[PDB]
Ligand SMILES: Cn1c(=O)n(CCCO)c(=O)c2c1nc(Oc1cccc(OC(F)(F)F)c1)n2Cc1ccc(Cl)cc1
């Protein structure tokens with residue numbers, strides 16, 4: 017058989033952080049809090065402006081003044 | 083009328099359960115309660131996990147902790163999760179202990195590779211195809227693989243070799259192989275710097291590019307960033323050979339061409355000097371190897387500018403060619419010794435043009451001894467050694483200069499042609515197999531009618547017989563002569579009066595002219611327009627991949643001048659301390675590549 | 689615009705022409721006669737009876753050019769001191785030249801011009 | 816396309832001897848025939864005595880085909896003097912019958928060239 | 930091509946012309962067989978209808 021197991025596994029620091037302690041909750045896909053609040057138009061930043069410019073303009077005016 | 087009535091009707095046990103007693107109420111379409119609660123995400127199970135894995139992941143985590151099926155009795159949850167190619171479901175299922183049955187091998191004849199394909203042979207083939215469709219998943223290779231690039235190479239190879247052995251199902255194995263080949267390339271597209279592009283190509287010297295070449299990964303090679311890296315090792319001493327003008331390129335290439343005996347006398351008397359290192363850069367080595375082959379062919383054109391000697395001594399030019407010939411015979415011994423060889427169609431023209439030179443020297447020596455004196459050439463026998471050596475020399479002079487066509491892949495304009503014209507040749511060779519049947523049939527028919535009227539070489543004017551005469555005669559009197567007569571009529575070089583006979587019989591001459599005419603119709607109006615019709619369709623399907631195949635071929639032409647073995651042209655040819663850090667950096671690069679490729683493929687699923 | 693893809697095809701045909709001219713002249717230059725030994729005191733392939741077709745390189749190139757159009761007769765393969773092994777080899781080299789040039793390299797040019805003209809007729813009104 | 820086993824693929828093709836494949840051929844059902852599972856079943860009746868004639872090399876195929884071609888008058892003299900023997904049954908497999916019929920037609924045309 | 934090769938194959942399956950031309954001139958089960966076919970057809974039609982209804986997306 018071919019045993020399948022996750023090679024080069026990720027880190028999963030805590031479980032209380034799974035339901036949003038650290039506010040910079042990087043998920044398996046590297047989606048922090050702001051990335052989820054930008055992908056869903058719910059209105060440390062890093063480069064969250066590039067993720068807003070690439071979808072639409074509602075929060076782009078918000079991240080441009082904060 | 084046609085009375086319509088439900089044949090092989092189903093059963094409807096109760097009416098109370100029509101509005102949901104039995105909780106396992108199978109509807110007409112075999113949809114139980116859980117199937118309806120899964121298709122509608124409302125949040126005895128049987129195989130309801132396979133119906134959840136195949137749509138989405140909300141309740142898949144729920145069913146993972148708690149007959150008529152639409153799935154074959156061999157599909158495993160992990161196999162179907164790999165068929166669907168969803169990253170989050172395959173991850174959830176691989177966190178636990180799941181396995182996949184390893185397929186034995188292409189040509190397996192063990193106890194169960196024969197006793198399973200002799201019971202069903204349908205379930206076996208289907209199970210094998212489903213296993214290979216699960217293994218060839220870009221998401222099951224991303225996670226659960228030490229290096230996903232070598233696994234993709236091996237899988238593409240195994241699946242390409244399986245579409246040939248498995249005569250049927252040839253359409254699914256090629257799409258699986260093209261799915262692996264497209265995954266191994268879309269992972270190299272995610273390199274952001276050049277420091278992490280030389281880590282991938284040098285893993286375990288471009289030691290991974292060679293493994294890509296030996297697996298025919300034409301898309302991994304020919305990737306823009308992989309070619310922009312090879313073009314810097316090629317022009318090792320020409321920084322910016324792409325900004326120059328075509329005249330400054332031509333006059334700089336010809337300047338290196340006219341200096342090949344000087345750059346080559348160094349590296350023999352100064353292997354570690356300034357001038358001695360200038361013929362180790364691959365581009366200069368190329369220009370010196372192809373300006374040494376143009377001195378061997380310009381010297382073959384001079385061998386025609388004292389002919390009654392039965393066995394003559396070698397001439398000046400035949401003394402000035404022998405080093406080239408010996409170097410070519412030697413340099414082809416090593417290459418077929420450092421390996422197997424016949425897959426390169428240029429190694430047959432190169433193995434036959436060196437046997438003819440051997441047969442030429444083996445016959446001009448036999449004729450130097452054993453032959454003393456000089457009699458007129460007008461009365462030599464036809465099988466005279468001096469007449470056969472001078473024929474083999476010309477037969478090999480043709481092949482020596484037909485070899486300059488392999489040098490076309492190096493050019494951006496004539497390379498894609500030479501590569502696209504050589505792929506239109508494998509469909510000509512199978513068309514020149516249909517024409518042989520027609521040639522042989524009509525030659526049999528035309529010789530069966532004309533062999534009674536065969537005259538002699540003396541009864542004919544100028545004492546000459548055959549079709550290479552000024553007045554062609556005896557065209558269909560022998561089979562070996564009928565075949566040549568019918569070959570030379572494709573080009574219009576056979577005159578019609580060869581249909582007549584002396585004792586003029588006007589019924590057999592007409593039948594013999596009608597057989598020749600129907601041959602002409604079949605070969606020059608039917609079988610010749612069909613060849614154009616096929617070449618038109620075969621060239622349209624080729625011009626799509628014409629730029630990837632050319633780059634794959636030019637990469638192999640480049641990689642042959644990167645080593646040090648055959649550095650010197652044929653005329654002068656005969657005169658674990660780091661193995662873990664090198665393996666640890668590759669794993670970090672692979673981690674980053676897989677992460678950003680997954681991120682780029684999830685977002686793009688819209 | 690169909691002419692820039694012909695000029696790069698008339699570069700492949702030059703290699704074939706040169707290779708086969710080299711091969712056909714290496715075999716036939718011993719039997720070069722004079723302009724007087726021949727009828728009507730005339731030598732070459734522009735004669736009524738063509739002769740000395742493969743005796744010079746400059747003459748072999750013209751002989752192989754004029755065979756694309758069928759204007760070179762087959763009896764130019766013979767020689768006076770008839771050697772039936774060299775005449776057959778010289779006829780077989782001429783025959784393989786004819787196959788490569790008139791059945792292979794000439795249908796390929798049509799196959800390319802068909803594909804090059806379909807991609808051109810789209811922009812034919814803007815150009 | 817929905818047959819899951821080979822036991823229920825020979826029930827369909829043998830209904831009323833491949834008695835339904837012949838009805839498909841006589842109606843020009845070019846897609847019912849040429850279905851991968853219908854051809855994978857015919858390729859095992861064709862190579863009736865060559866289990867795995869698809870794993871072999873092309874040279875081992877050629878030299879095994881010409882070996883049967885050069886034995887067509889011996890395999891055919893049996894089945895006439897031994898119709899129920901070991902060697903007499905070797906020319907009832909369809910592939911060997913084919914190789915013997917096309918190596919007997921190549922002896923009639925080589926005799927016409929003579 | 931496969932339709933033509935199938936007809937070329939089916940011509941060597943019988944026993945009539947087994948021997949090449951040179952030597953050429955020298956209801957008990959009919960109801961179970963019909964009942965199994967009906968079950969196979971029932972299953973095929975069921976799963977084809979299922980795979981065709983779902984596929985309409
Ligand atoms: C096969 N064939 C042939 O062999 N001969 C040689 C016999 C003389 O030696 C012929 O003259 C000959 C011939 N087919 C012939 O008619 C064709 C009709 C249509 C197409 C075609 O094909 C193509 F379009 F031309 F390519 C050919 N004709 C001409 C002919 C002669 C007499 C009579 Cl009554 C009627 C027609």
Ligand SMILES: Cn1c(=O)n(CCCO)c(=O)c2c1nc(Oc1cccc(OC(F)(F)F)c1)n2Cc1ccc(Cl)cc1
Pocket residue numbers: 514517518521562565566569570572776779780781782783784787791
């Ligand atoms: C290259 N070549 C050649 O040069 N000569 C001249 C020699 C006489 O001087 C030939 O007669 C000659 C020849 N190829 C020949 O068979 C072909 C088969 C298939 C295609 C083809 O190509 C095309 F479809 F026709 F275009 C040619 N034949 C005919 C022949 C002659 C003797 C024998 Cl045993 C077998 C075949």
